[PDB]
Design a protein around this motif. Sequence first.
Motif, PDB file in Angstrom:
ATOM      1  N   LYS A   1       0.775  -1.249  -0.099  1.00  0.00           N
ATOM      2  CA  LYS A   1      -0.026  -0.095   0.002  1.00  0.00           C
ATOM      3  C   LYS A   1       0.939   1.399  -0.089  1.00  0.00           C
ATOM      4  CE  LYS A   1      -3.621   1.994   2.679  1.00  0.00           C
ATOM      5  NZ  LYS A   1      -4.815   2.214   1.450  1.00  0.00           N
TER       6      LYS A   1
ATOM      7  N   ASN B   1      -5.030   5.228  -1.724  1.00  0.00           N
ATOM      8  CA  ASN B   1      -5.837   4.462  -2.841  1.00  0.00           C
ATOM      9  C   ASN B   1      -4.714   3.929  -3.651  1.00  0.00           C
ATOM     10  OD1 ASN B   1      -5.085   7.610  -3.539  1.00  0.00           O
ATOM     11  ND2 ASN B   1      -5.613   7.074  -5.368  1.00  0.00           N
TER      12      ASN B   1
ATOM     13  N   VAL C   1     -12.070   1.212  -9.439  1.00  0.00           N
ATOM     14  CA  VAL C   1     -11.013   0.232  -9.221  1.00  0.00           C
ATOM     15  C   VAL C   1     -10.273  -0.246 -10.541  1.00  0.00           C
ATOM     16  CG1 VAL C   1     -10.335  -1.967  -8.104  1.00  0.00           C
ATOM     17  CG2 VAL C   1     -12.339  -0.684  -6.828  1.00  0.00           C
TER      18      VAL C   1
ATOM     19  N   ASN D   1      -8.979   3.518  -6.839  1.00  0.00           N
ATOM     20  CA  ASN D   1      -8.330   2.478  -6.330  1.00  0.00           C
ATOM     21  C   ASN D   1      -7.797   1.840  -7.350  1.00  0.00           C
ATOM     22  OD1 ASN D   1     -10.761   1.897  -3.812  1.00  0.00           O
ATOM     23  ND2 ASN D   1      -8.980   3.175  -3.561  1.00  0.00           N
TER      24      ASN D   1
END
Length: 167
Positions: A9, A13, A119, A148
């Motif tokens: 991560k 996002n 996404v 994302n």
Amino acid sequence: VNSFSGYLKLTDNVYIKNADIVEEAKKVKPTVVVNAANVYLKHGGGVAGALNKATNNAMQVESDDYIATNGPLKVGGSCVLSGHNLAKHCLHVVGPNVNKGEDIQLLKSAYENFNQHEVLLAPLLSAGIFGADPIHSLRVCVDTVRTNVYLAVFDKNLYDKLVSSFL
Ligand SMILES: CCCNC(=O)c1ccnc2[nH]c(O)nc12
């Protein structure tokens, strides 16, 4: 919760992994896979050639019909086509090709296309054979995309440099 696994991560996002986008697509079957397209949707090499090969050339056949109807894309632009066996949809995004002399400022415009999708599985735009600095591309991605995004970076050496240098 979504099905992407093994990502680091980077921000709220943006996520990143050392992976082959073709293999990641076939396993996740994401709603959207991003192709590193050119304006003619000629999927000859790089990410585009690999994605197209994985579709048994169906991506190219569909793309040729799209161009015959609509003409070329803009540098910085995109179109949504089928994801074939890889994804529901493929978002073909044209980043500037430094090896063609295109303006790198257009990289931000290219990444803005991602914001139309909640996404996405994507490569770093303008990286690889498009000749931009992938460290810069990652920075523009983080500073432009608000939806994302799961970044697949094929080269392990590059993936580690991108992580270690990320601010
Ligand atoms: C390595 C420099 C440019 N990166 C790519 O071309 C790329 C990125 C992600 N997945 C891929 N699969 C595949 O064949 N090429 C890629």
